[PDB]
Paper text:
Evasins are chemokine-binding proteins from tick saliva, whose application as anti-inflammatory therapeutics will require manipulation of their chemokine target selectivity. Here we describe subclass A3 evasins, which are unique to the tick genus Amblyomma and distinguished from “classical” class A1 evasins by an additional disulfide bond near the chemokine recognition interface. The A3 evasin [name]-[name] ([name]-A) bound to CC chemokines and inhibited their receptor activation. Structures of chemokine-bound [name]-A revealed a deep hydrophobic pocket, unique to A3 evasins, that interacts with the residue immediately following the CC motif of the chemokine.
To achieve this, we mutated residues Tyr44 and Leu39 in the CC + 1 binding pocket to Ala and Pro, respectively; Pro was chosen as it occurs in the corresponding position to Leu39 in several class A3 evasins. We found that the [name] and L39P mutants exhibited increased affinity to most chemokines with aromatic CC + 1 residues but decreased affinity to most chemokines with aliphatic CC + 1 residues. In the case of L39P, the affinity decreases were only small so this mutant bound to 21 of the 24 available CC chemokines with affinities tighter than 100 nM, compared to 17 chemokines for wild type [name]-A. Consistent with their increased affinity for chemokines with aromatic CC + 1 residues, both the [name] and L39P mutants exhibited substantial enhancements in their potencies for inhibition of both [name] and CCL7. In addition, both variants inhibited the receptor-mediated phosphorylation of ERK by [name] as well as by the same eight chemokines as wild type [name]-A. To validate the structural basis of enhanced binding and inhibition of chemokines with aromatic CC + 1 residues, we determined the structures of [name]-A([name]) in complex with [name] and both mutants in complex with CCL7. Identifying the structural origin of negative energy contributions at the CC + 1 binding pocket enabled us to reprogram [name]-A as a more promiscuous CC chemokine binder.
Author numbering:
A (entry chain E): 8 to 72
B (entry chain D): 7 to 18, 20 to 75
C (entry chain F): 9 to 29, 31 to 70
D (entry chain C): 17 to 74, 76 to 101
E (entry chain A): 17 to 101
F (entry chain B): 16 to 102
Amino acid sequence: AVTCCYNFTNRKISVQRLASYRRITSSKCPKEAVIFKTIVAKEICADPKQKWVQDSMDHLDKQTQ
Amino acid sequence: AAVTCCYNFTNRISVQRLASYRRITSSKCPKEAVIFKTIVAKEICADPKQKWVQDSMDHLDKQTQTPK
Amino acid sequence: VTCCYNFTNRKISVQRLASYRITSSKCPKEAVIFKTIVAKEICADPKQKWVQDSMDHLDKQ
Amino acid sequence: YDYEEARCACPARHLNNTNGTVLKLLGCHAFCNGTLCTAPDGYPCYNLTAQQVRTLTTPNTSCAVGVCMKGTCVKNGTMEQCFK
Amino acid sequence: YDYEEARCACPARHLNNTNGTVLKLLGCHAFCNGTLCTAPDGYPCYNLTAQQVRTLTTYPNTSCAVGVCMKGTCVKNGTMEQCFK
Amino acid sequence: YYDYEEARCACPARHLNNTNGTVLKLLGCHAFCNGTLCTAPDGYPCYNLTAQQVRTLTTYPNTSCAVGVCMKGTCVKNGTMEQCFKT
């Protein structure tokens, strides 16, 4: 909606702890990021530059229909 | 908007022709991609793995006026 | 959880509407909900041309 | 002078379902702008009783799905867990 | 100045499903820019008819036939999904 | 010296059917086999339903059943749902 991330995560989250990720129209966001939904229903912010974020998105995408 | 995915990539792009981008499409999309909006108001699909796409997103981010 | 079972039979003048809202995905009939100056809610079908024009003329303000 | 109406057409709060189906109207009648109005023929509804309607929470009870015909919510075997 | 970045590469509105699966394309063709474009071989799709498409809302009402795009045809595979617009 | 099971926990079970044309899933991860209670193997497809839901099951598909996978006797749910019925 109008939801951006003011802070990124420090550590690399465990692939086993992420349930999904969400899209964003972050054109007007000060910082660009990805938003992970965790198995415990929490939302975490991650920097798309880091490689582990792309790897997590890959391992979570290859699990759909 | 939430049901908008890209089945086909551009493959062939110039930074001077892009007006904005959308970082990622829906999680439940068959193919994951970024969607660029061009100066001519057209939407193009690009593969986020390619380096020029990330460079375009970076040079397009460093163009939104931040405060002081 | 608010849906419209009936549309406005006639047609209401833009000068009598204050704003409009959108209804839910899981509603049996899809429609727009206009709020009138007298604080009443009317249902309108977005297919009708006057409804789209009224919503446009109410947005641009 | 300025407080008229415009045909029975105001919205009504439906009942929800956790199984992802159309939102159904509690009964086939609604109090719209101070009048009593009948839903259209074919409109999805729930068919509940006084005790049932009182036993409705936010889903725990099985509500009888039905279709509105001539102002009556005729049941059709199917039931859904519905909530307020 | 107002030319298309590249032939057949604009996004398309897929169809959604209450079953929690990949978003599938209605058919294997989409109107991209002013031209008609074919999805790639293997792209998930739905195979619907006129009567079905006219009865399509934002809540599931018809059982939609899942399929896979091969040479412009959405070849069915037996599976069905509750799909909505 | 004749009437044993011949193999502990190994008799078939009536699964639940689905109008979506997918694999037949076991209601829960447990079955009553030869008077004992049995757990499906880790990874077995299952449905995760509640008492009221399973009771609200007819022969026409009407409710969305939560698909899951059997792990350690629990039908761990996953995003997917199916219109499932008893036949």
